[PDB]
Design an enzyme around this catalytic site. Sequence first.
Site, PDB file in Angstrom:
ATOM      1  N   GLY A  37       4.966  -0.881   3.063  1.00  0.00           N
ATOM      2  CA  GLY A  37       4.321   0.301   2.791  1.00  0.00           C
ATOM      3  C   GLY A  37       4.992   1.436   2.601  1.00  0.00           C
ATOM      4  N   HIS A  59       1.041  -1.147   0.012  1.00  0.00           N
ATOM      5  CA  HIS A  59      -0.154  -0.116  -0.020  1.00  0.00           C
ATOM      6  C   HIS A  59       0.901   1.152  -0.121  1.00  0.00           C
ATOM      7  CE1 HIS A  59       0.644   1.026   4.447  1.00  0.00           C
ATOM      8  NE2 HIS A  59       0.703  -0.684   4.564  1.00  0.00           N
ATOM      9  N   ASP A  60       0.325   2.291  -0.880  1.00  0.00           N
ATOM     10  CA  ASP A  60       0.731   3.672  -1.017  1.00  0.00           C
ATOM     11  C   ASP A  60       2.272   3.598  -1.251  1.00  0.00           C
ATOM     12  OD1 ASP A  60      -1.747   4.688   0.602  1.00  0.00           O
ATOM     13  OD2 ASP A  60      -0.751   3.506   2.298  1.00  0.00           O
TER      14      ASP A  60
END
Lengths: 252, 252, 252
Positions: free
Chosen positions: A134, A116-117
């Site tokens: 992340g 994620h991200d």
Amino acid sequence: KIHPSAVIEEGAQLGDDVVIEAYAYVSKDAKIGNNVVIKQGARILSDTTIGDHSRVFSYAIVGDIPQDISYKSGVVIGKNATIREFATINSGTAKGDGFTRIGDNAFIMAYCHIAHDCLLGNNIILANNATLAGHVELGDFTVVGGLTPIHQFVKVGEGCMIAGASALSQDIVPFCLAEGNRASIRSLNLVGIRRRFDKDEVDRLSRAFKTLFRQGDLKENAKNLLENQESENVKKMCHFILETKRGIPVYR
Amino acid sequence: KIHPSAVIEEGAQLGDDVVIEAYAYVSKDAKIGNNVVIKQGARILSDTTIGDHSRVFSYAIVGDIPQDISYKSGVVIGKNATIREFATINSGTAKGDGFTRIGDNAFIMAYCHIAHDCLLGNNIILANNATLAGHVELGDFTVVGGLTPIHQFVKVGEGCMIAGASALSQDIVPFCLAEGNRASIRSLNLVGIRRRFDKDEVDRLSRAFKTLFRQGDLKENAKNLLENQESENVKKMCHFILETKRGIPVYR
Amino acid sequence: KIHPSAVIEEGAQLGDDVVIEAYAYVSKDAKIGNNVVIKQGARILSDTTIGDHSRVFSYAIVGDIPQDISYKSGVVIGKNATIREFATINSGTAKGDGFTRIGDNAFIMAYCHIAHDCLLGNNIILANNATLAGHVELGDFTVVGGLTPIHQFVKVGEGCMIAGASALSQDIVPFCLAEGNRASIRSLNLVGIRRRFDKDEVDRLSRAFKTLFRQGDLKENAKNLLENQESENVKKMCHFILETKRGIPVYR
Ligand SMILES: [Cl-]
Ligand SMILES: [Cl-]
Ligand SMILES: [Cl-]
């Protein structure tokens, strides 16, 4: 060109000359660019964009929710991506802006994981099983070799080489080669920079490397090296060092 | 025995008593031997041969194109292969002859990757996530433990053990155990050779090992050891050392 | 809620409000609890139980046969499990009782492998590509970081941290952090125990750690530390040390 077995949710936007093979999946909020190939079983999930002339290989998963206990959202992949089999590129969260983003010309090999991200630039190459935790950022032309995990919030500058069978916890200055566990800057990524620049820039980068890393305070050395500096590539090294949030690992 | 959901392209050749589970895929140029099991979702692609009594497990991919930017072609797998889930065995290129080849009795565990133009002998065992880069050759009875990558063009002789959680860059003499990163010969693969040979051959191999690796020039030592040599197994070690193209890594 | 493309063999037991996505597979002997989600392509095989409110992600395989040459049987997973994509949780054998067992609140990330006859407690977290070989036992709240294999028959006590990019061969005392290859106890898992206990138990655990590991015979030190001991958590450490079957690896 679209197999009847493919599950394309009403709402999916598909461009020209798209090929969706059997048993693939495209979501109601997905946007599949022109001349894209989605191979058998691959899943484009959430509010995910796949740019033109990309190829998603069998069973690759783009846009799954983040791997996180505490939990508009998706993944944006630029043009001409190659995502090999079983890759897991997860969506972003509200700690970023809901999106994981990958630039153009990505080459992402089998079993690769992008958390994620993340924010990957252009012409990134990830070898088999490279794993980004992340909020990892990779500059343009960075290579991450196989079976190497990068710790969350790590930044790798442009044109870096992170060697395979290593483990990365700190930030990596542009054009450098890092290796080990914990992985540390060993040298310039001489292969990558000789592919892209002239013998003159190369030598400028070698001098810059020695000037930065031989001895002394890295930030002191980067400000000094910015003095009157002619090369935008040496400048990126220097500013990156000055801006570092996780610090720079260096080998002795 | 063939699920209606299976995609068998017109042209696929299937032998007797074959079982193709739901959502599997067999190509127009594929040749599936007698008494083979292709489990749900697995894909036999390109000009690929799967020999008799083989079992391809869920979602394993055999015959996908090589992982390579710059790009008749396929994979040939011998009899009685076990290919576990999510394995990626890629086809060859015109830098070889278009084929990746695996002998009989292969046991290839989950997530294993075999790259373009590899050549594996018989009774090879690859544990979870072992990864062979391009043009790797493995002799009969070689074992590669889990999460270990082997560098492209590496040769591993017969009866080797390449330990798990290691990384291999150089050639490995037959019947040897290699470990580390970069991985190096530590000893004989004593488990493998005690399974296959008598206490007498074993002792011959132990003496041969000490004679080759204790001190001195390995090639000088291998020619000397060939002098009047009674054992074909010690001969393979010696000739392999003489023929080495990437060199032999040895631990001190 | 069940996609027509899903293959649910007659005999499968499904609870209330279950969602089986396209192309998933549930066996005739499978038992899917209430409020469970089986995502596209995942396969619940053999005599396998998935407890309530579990989520099995795309292409995860639960109940496949063990990876073993020489070969009632299945996998039991407790409530509120998260099994991410491409995970391989294999069934048990007659060397155990035919079952691989996982407690409640499991969080198992992508590409994770759990081998035959494992026994995992509650609130276990396995990061990407963590691999447990046969008969591995993990106590409640143990974390295993990414790309780490654990050797068969290893026991890890409650509340351990096994760091990523490591390799584990020996038993790990409860509440300890282990790292390396071969991996060894470095310290307490201070993050895990500060999440769960008060500053007072924490300090008790720190003293206990120093008392056990600073110098001397670990078993002698554990019996002494059991003398009049107030804390059930220090007792688990001690009894675990006394009961150890593979020994305890300790760093110097
Ligand atoms: Cl998802
Ligand atoms: Cl392909
Ligand atoms: Cl199975």
